Design a protein around this nucleic acid. Structure first.
Ligand SMILES: [Mg+2]
Ligand SMILES: [Mg+2]
Ligand SMILES: [Mg+2]
Ligand SMILES: [Mg+2]
Ligand SMILES: [Mg+2]
Ligand SMILES: [Mg+2]
Ligand SMILES: [Mg+2]
Ligand SMILES: [Mg+2]
Ligand SMILES: [Mg+2]
Ligand SMILES: [Mg+2]
Ligand SMILES: [Mg+2]
Ligand SMILES: [Mg+2]
Ligand SMILES: [Mg+2]
Ligand SMILES: [Mg+2]
Ligand SMILES: [Mg+2]
Ligand SMILES: [Mg+2]
Ligand SMILES: [Mg+2]
Ligand SMILES: [Mg+2]
Ligand SMILES: [Mg+2]
Ligand SMILES: [Mg+2]
Ligand SMILES: [Mg+2]
Lengths: 214, 23, 177, 37, 146
RNA sequence: GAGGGAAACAGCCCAGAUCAUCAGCUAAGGCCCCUAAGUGGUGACUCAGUGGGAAAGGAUGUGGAGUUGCGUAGACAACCA
RNA sequence: CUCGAUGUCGGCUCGUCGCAUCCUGGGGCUGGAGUCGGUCCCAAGGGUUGGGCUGUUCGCCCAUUAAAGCGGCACGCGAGCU
RNA sequence: CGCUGAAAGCAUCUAAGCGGGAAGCACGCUUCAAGAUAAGGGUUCCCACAGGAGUGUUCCUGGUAAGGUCCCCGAGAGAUG
């Protein structure tokens, strides 16, 4: 239903600059390199409109015959990552079209989606902000404990969705309304004001801000 | 209470001819 | 149905097409559409009038009989005459002005003026910064438009300020006596 | 509006209607507006 | 020894019911009867002897009284505060297949075989269905006098 | 003290299991589907999902039957003095 | 029902539900001029502070806050703690 | 809170019909999701092998294609998977 611009990139790290008001801004550096249109989804064939973009360098010996055939139909050289962008104007893209970082200008607000850093199995105190018990005052081997996990006979069960220990991180995260600080289109570099999910070297999807701004 | 009133109301069913154990 | 059995005085130069259950009325002002409800028969009464009948003496039949009778009368007389229902504004600083024949702009003591639109079937006629009216070729939609205009700022009971019907009996009360 | 199980006519201008399944009293005096609930 | 059907002995037919202006309960009773082969002399509760029932115009199912808004269908995910409610009118407009399938399932024995036999009920809110290769034959809901 | 009915349900209803039967008629209770048998026939009423919980009390809901006041010497509502 | 054991007051921890709503949202009537209120109708989405005294719950008090809600869940919660 | 409006010559937000109206309801925002066995969809890839018993050709073994896994170097992942 919505029209979205988008590009694929790599998280390179964070730096800082001072804007025109001499305010220190933290910027994430994104190698928002060349993306090619590798497939176009239309309501006639796939039931929805989207653009499957390809981004990244790949060793030809690491691409398979199915992947080689997909890219050969697209007419492009193989890319490492294939990501679909849901946009109402997917009909304006052609197969093999080159999409660069200059899709966004110097003050665009963007949504950045990435897979966040992983923490392994975290306890209730770290992954859910639980307070344990006191360090002293009699507490008996339950300092970082979840406390109670339910009631009594009624109901004789733990309710679904109770917050417990478990593996946290490595999940899809979108940060909204991030201001594009700058775009260097010739070298495919994007300075975005703020912090984005994921470790350095992780794939990022930069899209138009769904809620425009705040 | 709901439970006791339903217990006393069950006696009005067709196959219990106006009576039931424990009213 | 005294009104229902009362036929429709058709004016001169108006084409009334009774396409079975459909009504077409054409004159020098506009065109109107309504599918005459099924359990009512309509005839042209030797092409110069309308006879509206009811199949049975049950209650719903007379309901729709009277409704259809004066509906046809309303619609034909609208294509030939047009209507008017009038409102007036009271209170210091309150004014109504025209942004065309299809628009109204109010300064009803708010922070900013209120802009009021209309359907194509309703046109406004503001004759005074403190007197105006709503007309059209319909008679329920005129009522709802006037009701909403009054609802924008209904009369306060302490000085009478606001929009009111041209002869409204605003029930007032004395406050700081 | 006064919402009571027992709504009656207070004014001589009060009128008791049934509207949308509720017994109400409508007067020109806003005090006498009643609803059954 | 009373007759018992053997696996695929009884042939299973395809039917199409036009649910235009048909009450939901009548359609559901008729569909449940057809799906389980209750109209056949070779009926067996343990062997699927029923037919395939296609229901078209499932968005035009008739409801009496104020059921289109006041008759509610409930679902629960199992976690607290996880109850959703909709009306049968909104179900018929939005997901007519789910509405008809719920109505039919409530009218069948609570079984494994009934869960298998409910897969034979194909429901479509529009007047057309994709099963012309199976040649469903028209079925008229009718009553036998006396 | 089993069987059938009452959703389940010692004490309620029907009915007292000698065994077998892939015969029939019934009781209480039922006959749209779950669930065996009527989406039974005829005539009324209800529109509250009442049926499928509840009080004092409130109410132009609706259908029916009486008693009584006014009334084409023209009654009640509306419109003119 | 349970005495061939159904651990109990308060707190901590973790919640979840109801609405008989404390705040925020919508409204009718006012002995509603305005700013403020009173009252009863909708409404459970989110929220609903930190301390002194006392084992307390409760309560009084201090400084705040939009507000410092009332209840159920074995007077929720000791094979979770004290 | 109304508009039109009868039953009930008036009146009436309602009976036919039409409309405004809340942090509530369902969406809008984010995330998971075809074991959704109803196991979905698009694109791309490999393709008619060998031998037995056969019994509508069935079916069972064997070597492979595309593709993977074991193994090793690691981390942006991780208790182990
Ligand atoms: Mg601590
Ligand atoms: Mg310790
Ligand atoms: Mg315990
Ligand atoms: Mg009591
Ligand atoms: Mg005995
Ligand atoms: Mg017995
Ligand atoms: Mg039983
Ligand atoms: Mg004996
Ligand atoms: Mg018999
Ligand atoms: Mg009998
Ligand atoms: Mg049967
Ligand atoms: Mg019948
Ligand atoms: Mg019958
Ligand atoms: Mg009930
Ligand atoms: Mg009662
Ligand atoms: Mg024991
Ligand atoms: Mg309430
Ligand atoms: Mg809540
Ligand atoms: Mg306790
Ligand atoms: Mg009126
Ligand atoms: Mg599921």
């Amino acid at each position: 239903e919505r029209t979205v611009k988008g590009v694929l990139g790599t998280k390179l790290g964070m730096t800082q600059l001072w804007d025109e008001h001499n305010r220190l801004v933290p910027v994430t550096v994104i190698q928002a390199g060349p993306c090619v249109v590798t497939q176009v989804r239309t309501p006639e064939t796939d039931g929805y409109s989207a653009v499957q973009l390809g981004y990244g360098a790949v060793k030809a010996k690491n691409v398979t015959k199915p992947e080689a055939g997909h890219f050969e139909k697209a007419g492009v050289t193989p890319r490492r990552h294939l990501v679909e962008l849901r946009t109402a104007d997917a009909s304006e893209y052609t197969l093999g079209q080159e999409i660069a970082a200059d899709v966004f200008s110097e003050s665009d607000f963007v949504d950045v989606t990435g897979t966040s850093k992983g923490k392994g199995t975290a306890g209730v105190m770290k992954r859910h902000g639980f307070g344990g018990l006191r360090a002293t005052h009699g507490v008996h081997r339950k300092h970082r404990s979840p406390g109670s996990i339910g009631g009594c006979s009624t109901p004789g069960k733990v309710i679904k969705g109770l917050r417990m220990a478990g593996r946290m991180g490595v999940e899809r995260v979108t940060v909204q309304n991030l201001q594009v600080h700058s775009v260097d289109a010739e070298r495919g570099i994007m300075l975005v004001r703020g912090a984005v999910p994921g470790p350095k070297g992780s794939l990022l999807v930069v899209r138009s801000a769904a809620k425009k701004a705040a | 209470g709901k439970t006791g009133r339903k217990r006393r109301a069950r006696r009005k069913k067709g196959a219990n001819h106006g009576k039931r154990p424990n009213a | 149905s005294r009104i229902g059995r009362l036929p429709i005085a058709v004016p001169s130069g108006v084409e009334v097409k009774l396409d079975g259950q459909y009504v077409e009325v054409k004159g020098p002002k506009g065109t109107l559409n309504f599918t005459v409800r099924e359990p009512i028969t309509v005839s042209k009464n030797d092409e110069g009038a309308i006879l509206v009948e009811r199949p049975d003496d049950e209650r719903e039949n007379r309901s729709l009989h009277g409704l259809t009778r004066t509906l046809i009368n309303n619609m034909v007389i609208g294509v030939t005459e047009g209507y008017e229902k009038k409102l007036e504004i009271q209170g210091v600083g309150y004014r109504v002005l025209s942004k065309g024949p299809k628009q109204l702009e109010f300064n009803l003591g708010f922070s900013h003026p209120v802009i009021v639109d209309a359907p194509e079937g309703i046109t406004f006629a503001v004759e005074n910064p403190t007197k105006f009216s709503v007309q059209g070729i319909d008679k329920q939609v005129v009522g709802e438009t006037a009701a909403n205009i009054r609802k924008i700022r209904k009369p306060e009971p302490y000085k009478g300020k606001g929009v009111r019907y041209e002869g409204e009996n605003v029930r007032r009360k004395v406050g700081k006596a | 509006m006064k919402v009571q199980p027992s709504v009656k006519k207070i004014c001589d201008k009060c009128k008791v209607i049934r509207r949308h399944g509720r017994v109400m009293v409508i007067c020109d005096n806003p005090r006498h507006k009643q609803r059954q609930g | 020894t009373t007759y018992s059907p053997k696996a695929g002995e009884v042939q299973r037919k395809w039917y199409v019911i036009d649910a235009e202006d048909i009450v939901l309960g009548r359609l559901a009773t008729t569909a449940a009867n057809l799906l389980r082969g209750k109209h056949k002399p070779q009926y067996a509760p343990h062997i699927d002897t029923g037919d395939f029932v296609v229901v078209v115009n499932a968005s035009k199912i008739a409801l009496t009284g104020k059921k289109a808004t006041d008759s509610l269908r409930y679902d629960h995910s199992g976690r607290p505060g996880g109850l959703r409610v909709t009306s049968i009118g909104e179900m018929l407009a939005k997901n007519p297949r789910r509405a008809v399938e719920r109505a039919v399932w409530g009218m069948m024995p609570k079984n494994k075989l009934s869960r298998q036999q409910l897969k034979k009920l194909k429901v479509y809110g529009g007047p057309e269905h994709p099963h012309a290769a199976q040649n469903p034959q028209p079925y008229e809901i009718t009553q036998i006098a006396q």
